[PDB]
Amino acid sequence: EEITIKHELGETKVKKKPEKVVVFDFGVLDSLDKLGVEVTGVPKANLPSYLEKYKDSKYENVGGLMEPDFEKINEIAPDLIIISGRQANSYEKFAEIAPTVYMGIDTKNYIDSFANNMKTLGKIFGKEKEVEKELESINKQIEAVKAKAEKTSGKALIVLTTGGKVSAYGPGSRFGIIHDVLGIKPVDANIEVSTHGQSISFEYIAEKNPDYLFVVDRDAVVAGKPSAKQTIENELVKKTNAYKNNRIIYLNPNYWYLAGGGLISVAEMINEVEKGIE
Ligand SMILES: O=C(NCCCC[C@H](NC(=O)c1cccc(O)c1O)C(=O)O)c1cccc(O)c1O
Ligand SMILES: [Fe+3]
Ligand code: NI
Ligand code: NI
Ligand code: NI
Ligand code: NI
Ligand code: NI
C-alpha cells in the first residue's frame, strides 16, 4: 500500500504501515509513542528523559542524533527512516539505505509545519483520527494560553545557556512559538534567527529588562551537566524584573532542545510556557 511523501528534501515512496521504522527526530519519536506505533531503532545516546523507555533492549541503537551508525542502520534494513534538521546534511546517506522522510519545522509557520508532519504520520501509519484528536487538543491549549497571555502584558526574552555563554531567540526562531503562537510579546522583535541563537552579553539582558526570562539549559542535555541556573543568575541579570518577580522560567531542554515538533513535546512546551507566565 505504497504512498509518495513530498518533503523539504525530495519525494519518497513509502510502504504504508512499515514494519521497521528508524527515527532520528525525538518529536517524531514521542508522536509515534503517543499514537501507539512501534519503532525499531532510535539514537539511544541522546534520548530525552521522557523517552527513556526507548533505551530498552527491544529497540535497536542507531547511534547519536549527530552520529548515525550507518552500518547498523543497514543491518536493520528499515522500511522507513525519519530524520529532521540535525541530519539534513546526511539525507542522501540515509536515502541510499532505505526510504527516508525529512520532517522539519518551518519556524515561520510553526503550527502549520507541525500539523503537516503529524498528518504525514497519520497517513503512513493509519492514525489519521488519532492524529486529528491530538492536534485539536493542542489547539485548545494554544487557545487558553493565548487568552492568559493577552491579559496584562510585559515582554519576554528567550535565552539558551551553553559553556557559560548565553544566546538569544525571538519571533520566527527555533523557540519562536512563545511569541509567534502563544501571544507572549517579545522584548526584542528583531533577534537574528540562528540554530544555536544570537550571542549576547548579560548587559543586553539587563538592558532589555524583560519581564519574563525563558531559559533553555543546553549543557544539561548535550553534556549531561546542567549549568543554566549558575550561568544566568549573576549581577547583571538580578537587576531584571524577571528576576525580581521570580519569572526566570527554566524550560525543560529534554522537550525544548532535544525534541519539539511532536504531539507530546508541543503540549509539554505549551504547558511550561503557561506555568511560567502564571
Ligand atoms: O545542524 C545542527 N548542528 C550542527 C552543529 C553541531 C555542533 C555541536 N553540537 C552538539 O554536540 C550537539 C549534540 C547533540 C544535540 C545537539 O543539538 C547538538 O548541537 C557542538 O556543540 O559543537 C543542528 C541542527 C538543528 C538543531 C540543532 O540543535 C543542531 O545542533
Ligand atoms: Fe544543537
Ligand atoms: Ni555499530
Ligand atoms: Ni555491524
Ligand atoms: Ni479537527
Ligand atoms: Ni548570523
Ligand atoms: Ni516582588
Numbering used by the authors: 20 to 297
What does the paper say about this structure?
Siderophore-binding proteins from two thermophilic bacteria, Geobacillus stearothermophilus and Parageobacillus thermoglucosidasius, were identified from a search of sequence databases, cloned and overexpressed. They are homologues of the well characterized protein CjCeuE from Campylobacter jejuni. The proteins have a two-domain structure, with the domains linked by a long α-helix at the base of the fold. The siderophore binding sites sit between the two domains.
In contrast to the Gst–azotochelin complex, the Pth–azotochelin complex was obtained by co-crystallization with iron(III)-azotochelin. All three Pth structures have considerably higher B values than those for Gst, with the azotochelin complex being the best ordered of the three. The three structures are closely similar to one another, with r.m.s.d.s of 0.43 and 0.48 Å compared with the apo form for the 5-LICAM and azotochelin complexes, respectively. The conserved iron-chelating residues in the three structures are His227 and Tyr288 in CjCeuE, His218 and Tyr279 in Gst and His215 and Tyr276 in Pth. The Fe atoms were coordinated by four O atoms from the two catecholate units of each ligand and the N and O donor atoms of conserved histidine and tyrosine residues, respectively, from the proteins. However, this is also true for the thermophilic proteins, where there is an even shorter ionic interaction between the azotochelin carboxyl and the equivalent arginine, but there is no difference in binding energy between azotochelin and 5-LICAM. In all three isomorphous structures there were difference density features associated with clear peaks in the anomalous difference maps which were modelled as nickel ions. The Ni1 and Ni4 sites in each structure lie on a crystallographic twofold axis and are linked through the sulfate ion. Ni3 and Ni5 are associated with the same protein side chains in the three structures but are remote from the siderophore binding site and do not interfere with ligand binding. These nickel cations and the associated sulfate anion are assumed to have been carried over from the nickel purification column.
